Design a protein around this ligand. Structure first.
Ligand SMILES: [Ca+2]
Ligand SMILES: [Ca+2]
Ligand SMILES: [Ca+2]
Ligand SMILES: [Ca+2]
Ligand SMILES: [Ca+2]
Ligand SMILES: [Ca+2]
Ligand SMILES: [Ca+2]
Ligand SMILES: [Ca+2]
Length: 247
């Protein structure tokens, strides 16, 4: 598409996020999400127009049509630079995001997990905020989910968190992730095995204390077994995870 210089148009769209006309509101929210899907430059224009605090208030809305679009906007902003991610944090998104991990609406749940995952793909500061906001217990609980679509998104977000510093990995371990991940390594669903290996791999690349807890949990047995799985992608992923574990 096309270069557009957003004038005063962008702060004006932001104002309509507090309009009592939901059709104006939705229109603005749609345009913002489309903007936010561009690069870091487009994202920055949305931040600089003051969109973050208006978006965050919409995360309390009982209107799922508004909420889904606001989440999508925030997830996209969080796909930017670490400071763009921090902006989202600084605007108070995380408490609402964590409380949305309890939604019975799977579409909302997934969007919230996705957004969280994006924020957690940031630097150690951004990951720490996710941890401090109490995301881990819900995340570990979702590893027991029978909804494979939700499971994959929870595994990805955990994986991102476990891409942080050793104490951040330890945080994941202290929340109980290892037993759930080890159980997942016996799934007869190879898609799940791959997703679990990615996450477990990340954990296994922490320091000695994290590497040891990985062994205490029973992962080596499973990893060694999976070295010879029929599926050559799984073989490669179990090999990568085992190699990471042993550095
Ligand atoms: Ca109205
Ligand atoms: Ca720029
Ligand atoms: Ca509703
Ligand atoms: Ca439902
Ligand atoms: Ca990153
Ligand atoms: Ca299912
Ligand atoms: Ca400790
Ligand atoms: Ca199978």
């Amino acid at each position: 598409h096309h270069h557009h210089h957003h004038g005063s148009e962008l702060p004006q769209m932001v104002q309509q996020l507090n309009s009592p006309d939901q059709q104006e509101l939705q229109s603005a929210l749609r345009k913002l999400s489309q903007i936010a899907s561009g690069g870091d430059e487009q994202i920055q224009a949305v931040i600089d127009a003051g969109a973050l605090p208006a978006l965050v208030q919409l995360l309390s809305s009982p209107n799922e049509q508004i909420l889904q679009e606001a989440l999508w906007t925030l997830g996209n902003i969080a796909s930017g630079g670490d400071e763009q991610i921090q902006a989202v944090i600084d605007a108070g998104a995380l408490p609402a995001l964590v409380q949305l991990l309890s939604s019975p609406n799977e579409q909302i749940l997934q969007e919230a997990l996705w957004t969280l995952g994006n924020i957690a793909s940031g630097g150690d500061e951004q990951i720490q905020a996710v941890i401090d906001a109490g995301a881990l217990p819900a995340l570990v609980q979702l590893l027991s989910s029978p909804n494979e679509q939700i499971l994959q998104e929870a595994l990805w977000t955990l994986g991102n968190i476990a891409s942080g510093g050793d104490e951040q990995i330890q945080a994941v371990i202290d929340a109980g992730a290892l037993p759930a991940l080890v159980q997942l390594l016996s799934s007869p669903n190879e898609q799940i095995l791959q997703e679990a290996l990615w996450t477990l791999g990340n954990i296994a690349s922490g320091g000695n204390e994290q590497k040891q807890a990985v062994k205490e949990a029973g992962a080596l047995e499973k990893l060694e077994q999976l070295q010879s799985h029929e599926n050559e992608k799984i073989q490669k992923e179990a090999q990568e995870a085992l190699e990471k574990l042993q550095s």
